[PDB]
């Protein structure tokens, strides 16, 4: 019952931004989180009740508004790299109360970055099963990579003859860094889909691998000989 | 309250039984949380305890001993969708949440019938269908990819498979080199 | 249901003519919280008086206690001046 | 130590007349206040002078939003407590919760709601359950019973919490709380309306407040009418007392460990 928006964004140092959160539960506290890798969550700031805000752990860089019961913002003035992280808004009945649990939103993926000329869509190919391997199992595994994208930004999903298929199906659930040293490394992604032999071999069955890449929006000052890295569809194919 | 410790990662068999420990350094204490965050999805509540005793709600059991100041979310029956992030968070006397950094769990599928195999795919090398023992290693080379193990799941056909993709611009022999394979490992 | 206040006026410690002391009017039982408390020399009210917050009792009821530095003498008269719901007028209680 | 408790208040004002808090919450340790609140100042406040020198300024800041939430919180169960009474106007909602530390070691917990200065909802810890008063009572008792989870917390923090909230409070006021000031302890005596002589036990200048006075007759209990006066404070953190009989006789007073004979 907790609503946030946007749940991707990219961001150039300096930019301002604000985090849109609703419920319809009733709840009068609520709550703007920051999760990032290796701690636990780290409270920004909260609204314990309608009319009255505060600071958490970590309210340097942001400022929040408690618009009304429903809606509590977070706002980023001047956004910077130690900014990029995972946001989550969050709603409890009250506080001052031991027994109430966190409702929480779907989360808002930041990216902050200094100029955006790093940023870039995947380049989605299709591996075809290998005959020894038809031969040996009598399965058939289609693999997937998305690789060169930039921001981590990727969903990765299957479409087996126009429907989405799940059974089959392994996702890596973190890319990896294609230039290991480098801090604005690029990253690769991959995928399978396992099969019987005999749906594979059934020339009449489509497989398709999509990616959704969350880029760049539509008021962003673009000027490289490249074509624009926008949020897009990016897919590969192979018949049977 | 200051301090909340829970182990980083936690790795057992399917069908099996966990026991997630979370230990707090509290000023005051008004209940211990869990919360289940799937990779990429948003923390759910799953229980909370006040008082020492052992409350149950289905696979998922959850103890708290407020004087030896610690928990534990036990999990029976161990299912592959129970491969996720379990956090552990303790309101102090102040009713602030104190959050523990999280425990990863991996489920290790149970494999009836093991085949490793390196096959090549048009490029792509695929190891597969090795015992969840083996362990993949990331690669040492400069423009060599290595991704980390993944479990699929045929629900038609009941069957579960290991699996780790290689490639590079690199011969598929050589692809898993850094790993310890089985030797009955198949090369075609 | 209203409960009229108990009206307590006393001495800090025993009274002597001439001999600085405390006169306290303590404002018990009440209820509702809504009341006005006036210490009174002669009639006429005193400026400089002391008091301490609305307080809570068990039973639900409030009570207050106000006071003042003054030095007693045979002809001076003092009284605590309340009013409350409870009360038409105000209340003009005697320091004996 | 002496017996100690903890208790804090809320009072909760509907339609309140000009220069009266719509909510107002105070804390007491004993007869000392230790903090305040009100929807007028917004701000959680010491009443103590060890209250403000031992507790930091982020306890005041957390505090102060805890009391605007629980503000809004008071103001919402009064409109629907009006509504289940069909009552219109000024009404008053007021909370009580507290604990108690006796000399033995022992602990007490209490928590309730009264709707009009009248006994509304009293919490048992023992059975986790409300004791409601009425019918109005009873709907709010039942919607209060169905969250398990909050009742377990509730006796928690009544047995626990507030025990050790308590023992911090009578460290941080040591000096104040756990001092002993003797009582000055006087009979008098007068012959009031014709064949009729008073005798008066009057103490003052004593903290704590508790003290016990009774008149004997021969050593025994003086199954007579005695007449009591109130447990007053002076003004200087010092209280007052007295007791009165009509005419062997000895007024016996108790106070901090000492007892007092007084013979006439
Ligand atoms: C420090 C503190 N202050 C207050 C307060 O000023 N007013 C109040 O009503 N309660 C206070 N509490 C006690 C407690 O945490 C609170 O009453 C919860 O609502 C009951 O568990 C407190 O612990």
């Not at chain 3, 006169?23 to 509702?32: A, I, K, Q, R, T």
């Not at chain 4, 309140?16 to 919450?25: A, L, R, T």
Request: overall charge negative.
């Amino acid at each position: 019952g907790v609503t946030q928006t946007p749940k991707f964004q990219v961001l150039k140092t300096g930019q301002s931004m604000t985090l849109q959160c609703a419920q319809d539960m009733n709840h009068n506290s609520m709550y703007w989180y920051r999760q990032d890798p290796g701690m636990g969550l780290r409270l920004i700031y909260y609204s314990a009740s309608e009319g009255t805000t505060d600071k958490g752990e970590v309210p340097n860089g942001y400022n929040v508004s408690r618009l009304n019961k429903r809606e509590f913002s977070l706002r980023l003035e001047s956004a910077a790299p130690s900014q990029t992280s995972v946001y989550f808004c969050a709603s409890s009945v009250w506080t001052g109360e031991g027994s109430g649990e966190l409702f929480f939103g779907e989360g808002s993926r930041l990216t902050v970055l200094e100029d955006l000329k790093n940023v870039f869509p995947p380049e989605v190919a299709v591996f075809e099963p290998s005959e020894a391997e038809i031969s040996h199992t009598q399965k058939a595994t289609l693999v997937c990579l998305a690789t060169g994208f930039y921001p981590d930004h990727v969903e990765l999903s299957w479409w087996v003859n126009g429907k989405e298929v799940h059974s089959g199906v392994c996702t890596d659930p973190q890319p990896l860094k294609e230039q290991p040293a480098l801090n604005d490394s690029r990253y690769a992604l991959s995928s399978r889909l396992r099969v019987s032999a005999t749906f594979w071999q059934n020339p009449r069955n489509h497989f398709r691998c999509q990616v959704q890449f969350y880029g760049l929006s539509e008021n962003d000052e673009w000027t490289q000989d490249r074509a624009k890295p926008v949020t897009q569809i990016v897919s590969a194919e192979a018949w049977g | 309250g200051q301090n909340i410790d829970q182990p980083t990662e936690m790795t057992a068999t399917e069908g099996a039984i966990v026991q997630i420990n979370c230990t707090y350094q509290t000023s005051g204490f008004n209940g211990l949380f869990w919360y289940q965050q799937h990779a990429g999805e948003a923390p759910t509540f799953l229980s909370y305890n006040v008082l020492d005793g052992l409350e149950e709600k289905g696979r998922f059991s959850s103890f708290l001993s407020r004087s030896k100041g610690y928990s534990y979310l036990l999990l029976k029956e161990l299912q592959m969708k129970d491969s996720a992030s379990y956090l552990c968070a303790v309101k102090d006397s102040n009713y602030q949440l104190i959050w523990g950094a999280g425990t990863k769990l991996i489920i290790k599928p149970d494999i009836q019938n093991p085949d490793p195999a390196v096959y090549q795919l048009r490029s792509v090398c695929l190891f597969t269908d090795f015992d969840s023992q083996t362990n993949v290693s990331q690669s040492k080379d400069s423009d060599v990819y290595i991704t980390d193990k993944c479990v699929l799941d045929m629900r038609s056909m009941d069957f579960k498979s290991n699996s780790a993709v290689a490639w590079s611009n690199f011969a598929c022999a050589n692809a898993f080199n850094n790993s310890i394979i089985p030797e009955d490992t198949f090369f075609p | 249901i209203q409960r009229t206040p108990k009206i307590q006026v006393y001495s800090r410690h025993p009274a002597e003519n001439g001999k600085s002391n405390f006169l306290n009017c303590y404002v018990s039982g009440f209820h509702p919280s809504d009341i006005e408390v006036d210490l009174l020399k002669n009639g006429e009210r005193i400026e400089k008086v002391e008091h301490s917050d609305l307080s809570f009792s068990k039973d639900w009821s409030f009570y207050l206690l106000y006071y003042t530095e003054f030095t007693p003498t045979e002809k001076d008269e003092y009284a605590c001046r309340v009013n409350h719901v409870t009360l038409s007028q105000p209340k003009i209680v005697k320091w004996d | 130590m002496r017996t100690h408790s903890l208790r804090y208040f809320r009072l909760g004002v509907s339609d309140p007349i000009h220069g009266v808090p719509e909510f107002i919450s105070v804390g007491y340790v004993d007869s000392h206040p230790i903090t305040t609140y009100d929807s007028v100042t917004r701000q959680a406040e010491p009443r103590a002078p060890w209250m403000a020198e031992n507790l930091a300024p982020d306890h005041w800041e957390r505090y102060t939003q805890l009391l605007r939430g629980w503000q809004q919180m008071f103001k919402v169960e009064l409109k629907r407590l009006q509504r289940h009474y069909n009552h219109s106007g000024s009404h008053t909602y007021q909370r009580m919760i507290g604990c108690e530390l006796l000399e033995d070691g022992s602990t007490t917990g209490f928590l309730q709601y009264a709707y009009d200065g009248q006994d509304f909802l009293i919490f048992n810890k023992d059975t986790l359950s409300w004791l409601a008063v009425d019918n109005v009572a009873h709907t709010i008792k039942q919607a209060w019973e169905a969250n398990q989870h909050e009742l377990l917390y509730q006796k928690n923090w009544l047995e626990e919490e507030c025990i050790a909230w308590l023992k911090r409070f009578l460290e941080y006021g040591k000096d104040t709380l756990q001092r002993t000031e003797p009582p000055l302890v006087r009979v008098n005596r007068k012959e009031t309306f014709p064949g009729v002589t008073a005798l008066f036990c009057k103490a003052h200048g004593f903290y704590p407040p508790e003290i016990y006075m009774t008149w004997m007759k021969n050593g025994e209990e003086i199954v007579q009418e005695i007449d009591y006066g109130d447990i007053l404070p002076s003004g200087d953190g010092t209280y007052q007392a007295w007791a009165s009989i009509e005419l062997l006789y000895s007024c016996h007073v108790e106070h901090s460990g000492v007892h007092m004979v007084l013979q006439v």
